[PDB]
C-alpha cells in the first residue's frame, strides 16, 4: 500500500512540472503582450505532451570527449533528488514523518548541487566547465545564509519537525513575525534553484546553454523536469514555513487546498520575477549574499535567539 | 503501570529463556544452567540479545529497528 503512496506522490509532480512549464510560458507571453502556446490543443493544454514525446523520440548524444559514466549518472541523480525532496513535507500529513525533516531538506539541497557540477565536468566542454564553476560559486554564496535564516526562523518553532510548523502558525502566519528573514529566504530560494535573476549556471546570454550545453533529448528533459520540480518543492517549503494554513484534523482537504493555492501563488511570483528583472553577475551575487545578507542575517539570528528568552516565549518540544 | 508491566514482561521472557536453555544445554557436561557472567550479584539490565536471542527474526527486527524505521 505504501508503494501506491509513492507512485501517487511521484506521478502528479511530474504532471505538474509538465504543466508548470506551459503556465510559465503562457504567463511570460501575457506579461510580454503576447499569447503563449495556444494552437497545440485547446489553450495549449497538449503542449507538455508534445514536448515530452518530441524530446523522448529524439536521439540522445554521447560526446566523444565526455566521460560517459558521470554524464549518465548526473541527470539520474538530479531527478531522483528532486523527487525525493517531496516526502518530508507535510500536506497536511507527510509521506515520511521525520523527526529532523528540515535537516533532511538541507542535506538533499546540498546533494542536488553536486549533480549540476558533475554534468558540467563530464561534458569535457569549456562552457560546461564555466557553468559548473558558476554553480560552485553560487552554492558558496547562498549555503550559509540559507542555513542561518532557516535556523533563526525555526527558533520560534522549537524543533526541526515540519509538521510542527502547522501548529506554530495556528493563529498567525510567520511572515508577520520574521518578514526580513522571509524576504531573505525568498532571495535565497531564488538563488538556490538557479532562477532569474540568478540563472548564472545556465547563462543563456553568456554561456549558450551552460552546463547542459552538451545534453540533449531525454537527459536534457530529465534535467529540465528536475529543475522545475525543485522550483515547486522550494516554493512549497516556503509556503509551509512562512504562511501557515489552518489544518482541520477532520478535514485535511481544506489544508491541502490552501497549501496548493499558496504554492501556486509563490510559483507565479517566481515567474513574475523572472519576467521583470535582468541577470546578476555571480561575483555581484556573492557580494550581495556576503556583504549585505550575511551581517543582517547574523543580527537577525542573535535577535531571534534573544527574543524568546527575554519575552518568555520559548516553544515546547525540547 | 507501564513500569510494572515492563518488569513482568522482561522477567517472564528471561524465565522462558532460562527454562529453554536448561532444556537444550543439559547434554553439555560442564555447563552450569543460568550462570551469570558478572561477579556481582546485583540485577543487571538485559541486553536485548538475552531476551530475543531464541526468538524469530521478525520480532528481533521489530525490537531493534522497529522504532527507528517507523517514519
Amino acid at each position: 500500500m505504501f508503494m501506491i503512496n509513492i507512485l501517487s506522490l511521484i506521478i502528479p509532480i511530474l504532471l505538474a512540472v509538465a504543466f508548470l512549464t506551459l503556465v510559465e510560458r503562457k504567463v511570460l507571453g501575457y506579461m510580454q503582450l503576447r499569447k503563449g502556446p495556444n494552437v497545440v490543443g485547446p489553450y495549449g493544454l497538449l503542449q507538455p505532451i508534445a514536448d515530452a514525446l518530441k524530446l523522448f523520440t529524439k536521439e540522445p548524444l554521447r560526446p566523444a570527449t565526455s566521460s560517459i559514466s558521470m554524464f549518465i549518472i548526473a541527470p539520474i541523480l538530479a531527478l531522483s533528488l528532486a523527487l525525493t525532496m517531496w516526502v518530508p513535507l507535510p500536506m497536511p500529513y507527510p509521506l515520511i514523518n521525520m523527526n529532523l525533516g528540515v535537516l533532511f531538506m538541507l542535506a538533499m539541497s546540498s546533494l542536488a548541487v553536486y549533480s549540476i557540477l558533475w554534468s558540467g565536468w563530464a561534458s569535457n566542454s569549456k562552457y560546461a566547465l564555466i557553468g559548473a564553476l558558476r554553480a560552485v560559486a553560487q552554492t558558496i554564496s547562498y549555503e550559509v545564509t540559507l542555513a542561518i535564516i532557516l535556523l533563526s526562523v525555526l527558533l520560534m518553532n522549537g524543533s526541526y519537525t515540519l509538521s510542527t510548523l502547522i501548529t506554530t502558525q495556528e493563529h498567525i502566519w510567520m511572515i508577520f513575525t520574521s518578514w526580513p528573514l522571509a524576504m531573505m529566504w525568498f532571495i535565497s530560494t531564488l538563488a538556490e534553484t538557479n532562477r532569474a535573476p540568478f540563472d548564472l549556471t545556465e547563462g543563456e546570454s553568456e554561456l549558450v546553454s551552460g552546463f547542459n550545453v552538451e545534453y540533449a533529448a531525454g537527459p536534457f528533459a530529465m534535467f529540465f523536469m528536475a529543475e522545475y520540480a525543485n522550483i515547486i518543492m522550494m516554493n512549497a517549503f516556503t509556503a509551509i514555513l512562512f504562511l501557515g494554513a489552518s489544518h482541520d484534523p477532520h478535514t485535511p482537504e481544506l489544508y491541502t487546498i490552501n497549501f496548493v493555492l499558496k504554492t501556486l501563488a509563490l510559483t507565479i511570483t517566481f515567474l513574475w520575477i523572472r519576467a521583470s528583472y535582468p541577470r546578476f553577475r555571480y561575483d555581484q551575487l556573492m557580494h550581495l549574499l556576503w556583504k549585505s545578507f550575511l551581517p543582517l542575517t547574523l543580527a537577525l539570528c542573535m535577535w531571534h535567539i534573544s527574543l524568546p528568552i527575554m519575552t518568555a516565549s520559548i516553544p515546547p518540544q525540547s | 503501570l507501564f513500569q510494572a508491566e515492563k518488569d513482568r514482561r522482561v522477567l517472564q521472557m528471561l524465565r522462558e529463556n532460562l527454562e529453554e536453555e536448561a532444556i537444550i544445554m543439559k547434554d553439555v557436561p560442564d555447563w552450569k544452567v543460568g550462570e551469570s557472567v558478572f561477579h556481582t550479584t546485583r540485577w543487571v539490565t538485559p541486553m536485548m540479545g538475552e531476551l530475543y536471542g531464541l526468538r524469530t527474526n521478525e520480532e528481533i527486527l521489530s525490537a531493534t529497528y522497529g522504532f527507528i524505521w517507523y517514519t
Binding site: 503576447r34 499569447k35 494552437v39 497538449l46 518530441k54 550545453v213 540533449a216 | -
Partner: protein, 156 residues
Amino acid sequence: SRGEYVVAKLDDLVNWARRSSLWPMTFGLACCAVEMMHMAAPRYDMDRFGVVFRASPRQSDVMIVAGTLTNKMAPALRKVYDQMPEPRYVVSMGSCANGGGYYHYSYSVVRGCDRIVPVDIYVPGCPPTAEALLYGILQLQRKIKREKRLRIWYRR
C-alpha cells in the same frame, strides 16, 4: 490489417508531437534576422505555435538560415548543422540564403545555403515579411505531418 493500423496511429502521434514542438536555433546572420525577431514580436507570437528559440544546437529541431552565407561562415554553419540531433530541418530565409540574392556574383558569398546543408523550405523575399516566414513555418509543420516513418518501416 492490425499492425499497419497501429503503426499508422503511431505515425500520427509522433508526427503531431514533432510538428507541435519546433525549436529553432537562435541563429541569424543578416537583415532577415530582424524580421525573424519580428516573428517573435507580440503581433505574430511564434511561441503560440509551440515555436521557441533555443541557443544550444543540441536542444534545437530547426535551423533558419536568415542572412547571407559567406565563405568565412560556411564551415561554422555546417558545424552547427551537424551537431543538431536528428530529426533536423533547415529553413532558408531570404534571397541571400536562398541563392545569393543581391550578392550572387560576390567572391565571398556562398550561392545558396543548399550548397552546404539540405534545405526543406525556401522562404522568398528580401527580406520576407514575418507573415511569410510564419507561413513557411506552418508549411514545414504540414510537411512534417505528411511524413510516414513507421509505416515505411513496417513495409520493409
